[PDB]
Design a protein around this nucleic acid. Sequence first.
RNA 1: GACUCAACACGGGGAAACUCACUAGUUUAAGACAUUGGAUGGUGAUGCAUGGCCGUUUUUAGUUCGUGAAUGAUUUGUCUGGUUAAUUCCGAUAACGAACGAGAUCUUAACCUGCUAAUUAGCGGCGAGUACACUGUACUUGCUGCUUCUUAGAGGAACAUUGUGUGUCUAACACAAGGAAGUUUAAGGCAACAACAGGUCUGUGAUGUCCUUAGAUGAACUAGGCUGCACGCGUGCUACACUGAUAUAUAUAACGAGUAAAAUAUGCUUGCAUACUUUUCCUCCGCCGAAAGGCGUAGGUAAUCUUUAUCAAUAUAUAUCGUGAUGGGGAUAGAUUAUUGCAAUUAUUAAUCUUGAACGAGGAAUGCCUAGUAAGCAUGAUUCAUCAGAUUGUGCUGACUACGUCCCUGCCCUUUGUACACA
Lengths: 79, 98, 67, 157, 48, 138, 154, 41
Amino acid sequence: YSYIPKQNKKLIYEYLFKEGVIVVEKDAKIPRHPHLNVPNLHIMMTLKSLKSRNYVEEKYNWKHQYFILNNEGIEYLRE
Amino acid sequence: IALTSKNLRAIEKVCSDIMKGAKEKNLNVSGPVRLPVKTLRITTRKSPCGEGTNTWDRFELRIYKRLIDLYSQCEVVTQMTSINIDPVVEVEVIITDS
Amino acid sequence: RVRTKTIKRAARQIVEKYYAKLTLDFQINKKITEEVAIIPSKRMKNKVAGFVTHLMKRIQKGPVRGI
Amino acid sequence: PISKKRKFINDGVFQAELNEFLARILAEDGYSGVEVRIRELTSLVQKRFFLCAMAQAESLRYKLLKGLAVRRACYGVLRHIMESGAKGCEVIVSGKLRAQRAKSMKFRDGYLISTGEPSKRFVNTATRSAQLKQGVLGIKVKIMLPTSILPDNISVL
Amino acid sequence: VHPKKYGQGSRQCRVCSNKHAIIRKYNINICRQCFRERADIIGFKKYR
Amino acid sequence: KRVQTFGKKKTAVAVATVTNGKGLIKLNGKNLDLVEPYILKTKVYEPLWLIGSGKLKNLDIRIRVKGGGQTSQIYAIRQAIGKGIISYYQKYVDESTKKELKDVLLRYDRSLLVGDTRRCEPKKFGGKGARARYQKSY
Amino acid sequence: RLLEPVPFVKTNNCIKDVDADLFIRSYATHLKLHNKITYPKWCTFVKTGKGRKLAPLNEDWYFIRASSILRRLYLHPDIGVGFLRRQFSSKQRRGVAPNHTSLASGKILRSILQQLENLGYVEQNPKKKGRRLTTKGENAINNFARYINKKVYN
Amino acid sequence: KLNHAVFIVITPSAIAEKYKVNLSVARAVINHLADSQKLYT
RNA sequence: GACUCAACACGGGGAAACUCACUAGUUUAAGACAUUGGAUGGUGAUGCAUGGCCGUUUUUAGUUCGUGAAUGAUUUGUCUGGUUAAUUCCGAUAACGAACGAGAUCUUAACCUGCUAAUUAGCGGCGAGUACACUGUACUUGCUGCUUCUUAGAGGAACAUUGUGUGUCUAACACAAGGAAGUUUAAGGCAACAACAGGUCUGUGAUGUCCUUAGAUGAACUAGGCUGCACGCGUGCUACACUGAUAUAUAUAACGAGUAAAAUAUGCUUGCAUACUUUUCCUCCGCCGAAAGGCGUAGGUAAUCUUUAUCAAUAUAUAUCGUGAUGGGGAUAGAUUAUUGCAAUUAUUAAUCUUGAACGAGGAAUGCCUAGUAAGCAUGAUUCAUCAGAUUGUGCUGACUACGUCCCUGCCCUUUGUACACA
Ligand SMILES: [Mg+2]
Ligand SMILES: [Mg+2]
Ligand SMILES: [Mg+2]
Ligand SMILES: [Mg+2]
Ligand SMILES: [Mg+2]
Ligand SMILES: [Mg+2]
Ligand SMILES: [Mg+2]
Ligand SMILES: [Mg+2]
Ligand SMILES: [Mg+2]
Ligand SMILES: [Mg+2]
Ligand SMILES: [Zn+2]
């Protein structure tokens, strides 16, 4: 889609902060993440971005993506 | 009471333990009845490729369902069930008059 | 239908130590074996007993060439 | 409501997944476990759900990654195994390894039973693929544990 | 996007996302090679 | 009074309940007049013929058969009868008579008392049957 | 033809103590005599089941079928149409592809059942499952069997 | 070839052999005489 | 992709789309991070870069060490012989003694405890009847000691035991009795050492390098093709009839396997939104339908229901054929009625009518097989939205012939020869 609303992004970030970790499911056309109804692709993209900066650390298992938050990431999330 | 499990000996042990518990007092316990072991068989073809004289291999996950009856109150049965136990034997208690 | 060294070895070991207990009677021999040695199988145990019996038979009528 | 057969298979699958996850996570650990810092792991599992051979293998892989003389490392591992009271061991390392072409290298110490249900019982086996310079090195470790008695022995008193 | 709900390309292996050779009995949904490796952990022992 | 034994050929367990009565002899709910094919009828009647029809005027018999095909079922029935009558004799009638009957049965053939232990061997891959492999052209 | 020296007495009471085919034939004959059951419309140019690829060639096959059905009903507690169909199945040669088992044309069977119920021989039981025999019908059947036995003896 | 006809110690085969006939006709003949394999005298 | 065994119904590969790698084209960013660097994806290239896994050598009996002995590679052990399914033993001996492999172990199937247990299995117990016998038998509703059958846990049982032969009267074999069983009882599973430049990067986010990266060899969509056909070689199915087809009737298995889309109502312009609940798989049963199938409902997340004291066909019994390409045979074709699916033409499959081809037992060659086996007969499951002629299990009908041999073929061994070692 390539929209990425800002509010949605913020919500996602908040969720991540609350958790500390995000299990993504590396699926293209799956609509929603289990808890928060966000287009999953967007979420995936965001997580990728985070990984790129090393704000989040990833350990890929089968199907799922299993993202764990780094201390820098946590600091950033303070906002 | 239905005891579903994968491991035979363990299941048997559990059954024995419950029998022992019952024999304490107050329990008209019917003996352990082991049910027809409905074996999950998968016949997979060995070899990722198509090379070699296509050997199959019959796997068998053989589930042991076990069954046991009682005429009792819930709390007592719960207590009886508490033999500690572990992740391996799956227990289910039915507290029905019928 | 022949016996491996493990069976044979076991037989040899018995009759060295427990010749006293044994007599030409199969069941008795088997019992003795059970009492003494640590055979995990049934069939294997039976086989061992049989070979012991055979050994015993062979003695009394002569030297075995062992024990 | 889900049937018993279906349930069992599902459980098995879950177990497998858990194992894989652990493997992915714990490159720095003597991993065997599977019974349920760690907070994150717990969270992950919740999200999802709603002496030993493996450890030795992991260690070997780590060593390889670090960059040792290989043979020496293997020897060390063997020694360690011996110390830990193993009746027998076996390590294989096949792959690229120094040369381009081929080269599988065995490393046995004590005796290693291969055939029978005893093998299935009385050996712990483990397989890791250590990624390296220009490909992968292929660990397989095989340990024969202390027996609860072997079928071959007939111990007369 | 075109109907991806009922066909070989609809679903996949749980493990490696391969559309070919999926053990679809008991809702296992693992392509058979992968299953062969993880048959120990799932609790599938070869007896006979 | 009443005695329950089985026969066994392949899969096909014929359970013979042998009781005190007038001498009818039946299968599930049907007389041994039927069985099914006229040719094989003799394999069921044979033990009776050996022992004598007068000896079974004291003994009613019902037989419950389950599993197997046709011939196998018949064999099972026969086996049940053989075991059954003899078993009855061993308990509620004399021993000498029982022995005599056993001897008679032995003289006729095995299979009446002792069972046929054969059973369908597992099919093996690379073929259709137990041994029968497929085909190589080179 | 059937009779022989046997080593027991036969309690010729119910239909289970009668030889089947002969009994069926007798019942068919009786039906014909009565004119108790019809031969609808399509009966005279239908095929009894997928596998038959050919008409019956018996003229009064319907009657025979009915008789068979009666017997079946007597045998079992509660018996449907599907069950009946299964019972009257045969091998369908698919020419070149190997044979499969072939479920019978159930419509005719259903019609027969309906006819029987109209006449008062079978009974759709509200408890349990599909259509068993009605007691009067059963009695009649038993009587017929007895008659047959008597005839055979004679 | 042997095109047997229809219009004009007992067994059907024998009958066929003797008068050169279809075996349905033989069967019919047998039936008449009387009045899935066969034997008659 | 794979090419002798060890490619050729194989890649679980029965592809209408998806699968899809291909062809004709069309979109898209799933271009992270500091238009540039820089990754990310690949059913792209390379199995002769590799991992793991699998195959074969090989299910045969083989491999190795310690010390000793015999410039070196090495040999011996690990063998003239007998024996064994077996470097299995015995016996001889510059060896003695080990270890892996074999054997044992594991899993079934084989027969017992007339001990352990009794549902979701039965047997009786017994009420209630409906039919008929004699002075009990067949069949259903209602209620609740035994464990033979039904399930499945622990035990037992065969060890060549006793008998008699042949054998260095060694290891062992043959016969007889007993016995459920006497070819480790039958069947598998497991699988040493060392390889093959065997296969697989088209199973993988196991994975190197090289390529490609927006006019992508990434992903997504629309068709089309893998099924195209003078022909050669595979694996099968169906046949060539009368021990049979045809059509009625009768008989009787075992292993099994079974749970985002639709319905109805409200609100507005066939569409959306809102509310609410059965259906998504096995089908009982009741109706419609020649048939296929349909509609309605019922049980089943399963020893309960499908259904299993019977889901099958060969069987068998009675009729029609009558040796005539014949009613053997059902190819090829023509035209409908359905079902699956967004979509059925290059016909998914199914049914109904009709079409009536080759084939009268198969040449050169070559495959499989020794007892519940061959063959015949079906059938469950795997693929599956739909579709077995495949595979894989399971049963049912139940032969012939050995009971050995090295003649061929292939492996293995000792000796021998070699200029071969890519053997
Ligand atoms: Mg071994
Ligand atoms: Mg298709
Ligand atoms: Mg396509
Ligand atoms: Mg290779
Ligand atoms: Mg040597
Ligand atoms: Mg072995
Ligand atoms: Mg193709
Ligand atoms: Mg196939
Ligand atoms: Mg050959
Ligand atoms: Mg040279
Ligand atoms: Zn996979």
